[PDB]
Design an enzyme around this catalytic site. Sequence first.
Site, PDB file in Angstrom:
ATOM      1  N   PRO A  39       0.802  -1.192   0.032  1.00 50.98           N
ATOM      2  CA  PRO A  39       0.066   0.016   0.047  1.00 50.98           C
ATOM      3  C   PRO A  39       0.902   1.369  -0.079  1.00 50.98           C
ATOM      4  O   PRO A  39       1.903   1.405   0.624  1.00 50.98           O
ATOM      5  CB  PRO A  39      -0.896  -0.108   1.421  1.00 50.98           C
ATOM      6  CG  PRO A  39      -0.861  -1.590   1.713  1.00 50.98           C
ATOM      7  CD  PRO A  39       0.508  -2.133   1.047  1.00 50.98           C
ATOM      8  N   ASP A  40      -0.040   2.356  -0.646  1.00 53.44           N
ATOM      9  CA  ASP A  40       1.038   3.649  -0.610  1.00 53.44           C
ATOM     10  C   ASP A  40       0.489   4.167   0.801  1.00 53.44           C
ATOM     11  O   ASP A  40       0.079   5.561   0.707  1.00 53.44           O
ATOM     12  CB  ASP A  40       0.768   4.367  -1.821  1.00 53.44           C
ATOM     13  CG  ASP A  40      -0.937   4.670  -1.945  1.00 53.44           C
ATOM     14  OD1 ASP A  40      -1.617   3.943  -1.383  1.00 53.44           O
ATOM     15  OD2 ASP A  40      -1.294   5.414  -2.586  1.00 53.44           O
ATOM     16  N   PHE A  41       0.764   3.554   1.788  1.00 52.78           N
ATOM     17  CA  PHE A  41       0.713   4.343   3.222  1.00 52.78           C
ATOM     18  C   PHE A  41       1.896   3.673   3.996  1.00 52.78           C
ATOM     19  O   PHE A  41       1.838   2.492   4.060  1.00 52.78           O
ATOM     20  CB  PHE A  41      -0.699   3.652   4.001  1.00 52.78           C
ATOM     21  CG  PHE A  41      -1.066   4.340   4.983  1.00 52.78           C
ATOM     22  CD1 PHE A  41      -0.452   4.020   6.337  1.00 52.78           C
ATOM     23  CD2 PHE A  41      -1.695   5.558   5.092  1.00 52.78           C
ATOM     24  CE1 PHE A  41      -0.859   4.452   7.534  1.00 52.78           C
ATOM     25  CE2 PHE A  41      -1.893   6.121   6.350  1.00 52.78           C
ATOM     26  CZ  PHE A  41      -1.494   5.458   7.567  1.00 52.78           C
ATOM     27  N   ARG A  42       2.642   4.524   4.479  1.00 50.06           N
ATOM     28  CA  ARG A  42       4.030   4.218   4.878  1.00 50.06           C
ATOM     29  C   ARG A  42       3.924   4.715   6.360  1.00 50.06           C
ATOM     30  O   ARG A  42       5.008   4.578   7.245  1.00 50.06           O
ATOM     31  CB  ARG A  42       5.008   4.877   4.143  1.00 50.06           C
ATOM     32  CG  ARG A  42       5.424   6.009   3.922  1.00 50.06           C
ATOM     33  CD  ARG A  42       6.109   6.706   2.583  1.00 50.06           C
ATOM     34  NE  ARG A  42       5.338   5.899   1.561  1.00 50.06           N
ATOM     35  CZ  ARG A  42       4.488   6.543   0.658  1.00 50.06           C
ATOM     36  NH1 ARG A  42       4.041   7.651   1.077  1.00 50.06           N
ATOM     37  NH2 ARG A  42       3.910   5.803  -0.169  1.00 50.06           N
ATOM     38  N   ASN A 113      10.680   4.266  -5.027  1.00 52.38           N
ATOM     39  CA  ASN A 113      10.493   2.875  -4.547  1.00 52.38           C
ATOM     40  C   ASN A 113      11.567   2.297  -4.137  1.00 52.38           C
ATOM     41  O   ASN A 113      12.760   2.239  -4.734  1.00 52.38           O
ATOM     42  CB  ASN A 113       9.646   2.044  -5.287  1.00 52.38           C
ATOM     43  CG  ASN A 113       8.311   2.571  -5.749  1.00 52.38           C
ATOM     44  OD1 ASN A 113       7.785   3.632  -5.132  1.00 52.38           O
ATOM     45  ND2 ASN A 113       7.319   1.775  -6.452  1.00 52.38           N
ATOM     46  N   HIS A 132      15.718   7.272  -3.944  1.00 50.19           N
ATOM     47  CA  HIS A 132      15.767   6.983  -2.573  1.00 50.19           C
ATOM     48  C   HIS A 132      16.116   5.715  -1.901  1.00 50.19           C
ATOM     49  O   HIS A 132      15.601   5.234  -0.868  1.00 50.19           O
ATOM     50  CB  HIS A 132      14.224   7.235  -1.915  1.00 50.19           C
ATOM     51  CG  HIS A 132      13.920   8.678  -2.438  1.00 50.19           C
ATOM     52  ND1 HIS A 132      12.436   9.202  -2.617  1.00 50.19           N
ATOM     53  CD2 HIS A 132      14.476   9.816  -2.603  1.00 50.19           C
ATOM     54  CE1 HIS A 132      12.614  10.687  -2.815  1.00 50.19           C
ATOM     55  NE2 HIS A 132      13.821  10.782  -3.183  1.00 50.19           N
ATOM     56  N   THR A 207       3.024   8.409  -8.646  1.00 46.66           N
ATOM     57  CA  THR A 207       3.748   9.325  -7.887  1.00 46.66           C
ATOM     58  C   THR A 207       2.839  10.538  -7.653  1.00 46.66           C
ATOM     59  O   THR A 207       2.462  11.101  -8.863  1.00 46.66           O
ATOM     60  CB  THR A 207       5.142   9.445  -8.152  1.00 46.66           C
ATOM     61  OG1 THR A 207       5.453  10.506  -7.316  1.00 46.66           O
ATOM     62  CG2 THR A 207       5.274  10.019  -9.644  1.00 46.66           C
TER      63      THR A 207
END
Length: 295
Positions: A39-42, A113, A132, A207
């Site tokens: 998921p795009d929840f970090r 990513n 990153h 993104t």
Amino acid sequence: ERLLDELTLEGVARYMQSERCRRVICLVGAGISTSAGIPDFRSPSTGLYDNLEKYHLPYPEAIFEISYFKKHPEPFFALAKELYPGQFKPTICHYFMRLLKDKGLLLRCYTQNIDTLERIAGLEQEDLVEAHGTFYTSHCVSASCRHEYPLSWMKEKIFSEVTPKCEDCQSLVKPDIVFFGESLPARFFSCMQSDFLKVDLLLVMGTSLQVQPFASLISKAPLSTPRLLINKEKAGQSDPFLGGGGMDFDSKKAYRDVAWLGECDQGCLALAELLGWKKELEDLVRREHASIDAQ
Ligand SMILES: [Zn+2]
């Protein structure tokens, strides 16, 4: 007046299959991996954040920050455990980038990513700017040692809730990611400087283009270079509160930016289809997924 005959996916595909378009740069982020089950929840879950009270996060987002990591690494590794993917099966979108590579079109994939899926999908170090960093490798944090640890080793430390220590020197072993507050790798800037002179198409996928300097890559494209965003929502437009290089999809002046709004996999499938690559993409994905499932 413009390289795209129309500001649509169809226009982009026709441009890609013209002599004008030789070099594609992809810029990707977390949205390309959500359909891989990442998921795009970090942020830490509520339970995790509460479990971490004893590490006195000065603010909840400190868990992403290098300064805080250097004071207390355990919150980061607990977050890493909570966020650790159950499988590493790249998406249709990742394999679309592999097709770009296979077809000699991929100049570079700049990824935010850290999930390694670009590598699994067959993008090689040369094809990639892991802006990153990545979990693919980890290193002992002591300059005198710098022992490199593969993801399998790091995974075992993360899941066992053992803070990873180097076997050679007992220093911390840090995944090779770029924490918030850390500088990006030299490779990012060296590649940016060369690649954006050469790019014929910028493909931006998954993104929100919020983190800098990565987001500013869109402004490094030549003015003529078409820019296709495949994303659930428009991103990269100018901030009306500031009053460069913002995406202009919809003004009267729009001439080169295309937004395809939806799932990255579906957008890449649609683009592949327009290029005559849909069967190739389907076959690649099916075989790679099968291979990964068989691990
Ligand atoms: Zn060491």
